[PDB]
Design a protein around this ligand. Sequence first.
Ligand code: NI
Length: 448
Amino acid sequence: AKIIFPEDFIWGAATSSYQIEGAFNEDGKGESIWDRFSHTPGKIENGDTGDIACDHYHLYREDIELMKEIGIRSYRFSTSWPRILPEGKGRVNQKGLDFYKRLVDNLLKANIRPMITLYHWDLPQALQDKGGWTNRDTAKYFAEYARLMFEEFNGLVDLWVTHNEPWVVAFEGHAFGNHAPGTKDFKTALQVAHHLLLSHGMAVDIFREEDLPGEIGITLNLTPAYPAGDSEKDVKAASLLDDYINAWFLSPVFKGSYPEELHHIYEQNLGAFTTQPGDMDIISRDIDFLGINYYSRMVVRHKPGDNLFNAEVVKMERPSTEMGWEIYPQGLYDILVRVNKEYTDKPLYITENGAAFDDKLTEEGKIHDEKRINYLGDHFKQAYKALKDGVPLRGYYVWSLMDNFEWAYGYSKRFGLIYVDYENGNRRFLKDSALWYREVIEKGQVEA
Ligand code: NI
């Protein structure tokens, strides 16, 4: 037919260390802020924790086989800093490294390509006991932990991602305080944001220095923003929102500056966050690819306004996912061709896209997840289009490989290609979407 992708397009799926591994205190692993946040009453839906999750730490071999079965060509996973360096610094917990050495090794022997995400949110709680990310030191320790892992997987691991979604880490975790470490101080969020960006660059410096065979990049969450009404008071009010999530990390990375309008209104109202001459040079070291997480677009309407933009986000009623996320596949086209136009020529990876539906497990272990199938197809076709015009899209990682711990929502939301029956064997069922996806990869083509 048509809509056939490059033959060596990297089709993959993604997970995260805290969300799937479990074994939270097992084998010398140290306490993370997510362990903390989790065991704090009132933080997670239904009082869920990552304490066991999918028991991936123990079932990883089964999981590779399940990957093999879906036929994915790359697997994006997160590497737990506290499990490897329990204090964040100092002594290396060997048994924790061995785990990932084992994982990688199965991945390679099954001809699946590892892409490792260095920091997927699970900061060691001992670093949080110094400032956490408001402490410059944390950036320095991140780099060292980054160095450790480069050295270890030198010949083995090919694609590296320093950070997953700095924006949310910063704002969700230190502004609105419904992610670890749970703080609520917009000022400290701005500082955290700056130190994440910093540590990123430091890591990419160490990368080049160590001279590992692969390519390094970073994963930002982009969400295009658009004006509700025709108002000029809306356009201006959406540009803000957009720069507040997107330009605010894109610019420092690719252009070596924060976005001035916002930079200025921040400093106006709150203070200055402490920079340090030559920081913006570290932040914008040359990288080899950008990684993009997309789920939806936002509609912004001017309306004063407890905040200072002074905007609000309009709930639509388009069809939506179980998270309440407006399904709107073309926005993904827009945003891909946009990053390419305004920010970088470097190759692009969709490192996260997917949706949660209200899955029902059939008595014979079947899960006919039609809605998911459609959602994936829709966004899959949009990527094809971006590909069909300028953009150097190299791969697409479906969130997620399996159902897992949806942070504050806990296990109430299932994003998997594989359905996970926690309460039972913690046993795994391939959804229809998984099997449908096996075909998209093999035949090399989706289908409208
Ligand atoms: Ni997620």
